Amino acid sequence: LPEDPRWELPRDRLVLGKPLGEGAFGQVVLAEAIGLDKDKPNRVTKVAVKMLKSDATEKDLSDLISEMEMMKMIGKHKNIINLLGACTQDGPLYVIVEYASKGNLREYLQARRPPLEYSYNPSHNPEEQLSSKDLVSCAYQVARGMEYLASKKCIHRDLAARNVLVTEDNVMKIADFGLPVKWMAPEALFDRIYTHQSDVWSFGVLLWEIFTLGGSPYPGVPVEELFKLLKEGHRMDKPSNCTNELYMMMRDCWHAVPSQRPTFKQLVEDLDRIVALTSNQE
Numbered sequence: 001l002p003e004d005p006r007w008e009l010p011r012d013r014l015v016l017g018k019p020l021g022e023g024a025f026g027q028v029v030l031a032e033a034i035g036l037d038k039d040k041p042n043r044v045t046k047v048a049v050k051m052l053k054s055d056a057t058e059k060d061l062s063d064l065i066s067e068m069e070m071m072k073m074i075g076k077h078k079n080i081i082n083l084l085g086a087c088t089q090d091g092p093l094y095v096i097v098e099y100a101s102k103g104n105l106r107e108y109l110q111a112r113r114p115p116l117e118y119s120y121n122p123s124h125n126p127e128e129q130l131s132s133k134d135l136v137s138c139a140y141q142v143a144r145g146m147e148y149l150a151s152k153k154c155i156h157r158d159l160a161a162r163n164v165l166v167t168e169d170n171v172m173k174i175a176d177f178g179l180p181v182k183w184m185a186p187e188a189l190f191d192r193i194y195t196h197q198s199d200v201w202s203f204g205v206l207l208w209e210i211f212t213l214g215g216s217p218y219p220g221v222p223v224e225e226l227f228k229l230l231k232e233g234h235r236m237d238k239p240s241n242c243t244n245e246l247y248m249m250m251r252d253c254w255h256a257v258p259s260q261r262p263t264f265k266q267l268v269e270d271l272d273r274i275v276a277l278t279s280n281q282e
């Protein structure tokens with residue numbers, strides 16, 4: 001790997017900590033970076049570090065590098081997982097990125113379900129219920145991250161609550177944008193055609209995940225029937241606790257004709273307005 005002084009951090013500035021989550025983003029560990037900012041060399045910053053597994057292949061290395069390089073080009077946004085640095089010399093490739101201490105959006109929401117036969121809270125460490133405004137805001141932030149990525153001509157291909165991470169301060173950050181059928185637009189599923197419009201379809205499913213507090217889409221519908229049923233016009237019913245307006249947004253995201261779906265730009269404007277009008281008492 002050739003050096004890139006723009007991003008390089010010396011290996012001994014990282015204090016490698018524990019594995020994060022359960023490997024959904026590869027082998028990622030929590031770490032402390034000493035002097036990640038050259039301006040503040042005596043500060044430690046909690047970061048996430050991605051590296052290769054032990055019995056990796058030449059494919060895995062090229063993918064990690066490709067991921068890193070794409071993230072270098074993508075630029076910063078507060079609602080995406082940002083690249084912070086890399087250790088490419090004198091040892092294994094480390095890709096240093098932002099740390100999101102509250103985990104993926106699905107588990108985040110599930111843990112915040114009311115303590116319920118209908119919608120069961122699987123966490124042994126449940127957390128305070130989210131207000132109705134918090135929930136719309138979570139949708140708005142995801143949309144903002146996607147609006148940014150789409151503006152940089154990035155197609156995600158796997159947008160879903162599990163690929164949004166939540167920081168200590170409850171900021172939503174899109175993950176895994178740098179290199180499942182129940183989140184795919186019919187045209188992606190059928191014909192392998194991935195676009196910003198198919199990401200919008202996925203966003204609709206993600207909205208449904210939000211308003212079911214981490215519910216599993218198309219409950220009990222076998223994968224092998226799903227494209228057939230989507231072709232026939234099957235769409236998820238409204239979550240029990242969802243406004244008609246947010247449901248209509250989901251439905252629009254699931255337009256059969258890709259050109260008729262809203263853009264992320266429009267979704268952001270729409271969610272911005274909905275967030276403003278959502279009661280902060282409920």
Ligand SMILES: COc1cc(CCc2cc(NC(=O)c3ccc(N4C[C@@H](C)N[C@@H](C)C4)cc3)[nH]n2)cc(OC)c1
Nearest residue numbers: 020021025048050081098099100101102103175176177
């Ligand atoms: C482009 O995209 C990425 C994303 C990443 C992942 C970076 C990352 C991962 C995390 N974080 C966790 O993975 C995490 C943290 C806490 C979790 N939980 C466990 C849960 C049971 N309780 C909860 C209270 C907390 C569960 C998961 N931050 N940054 C790496 C990357 O390389 C290049 C690129």
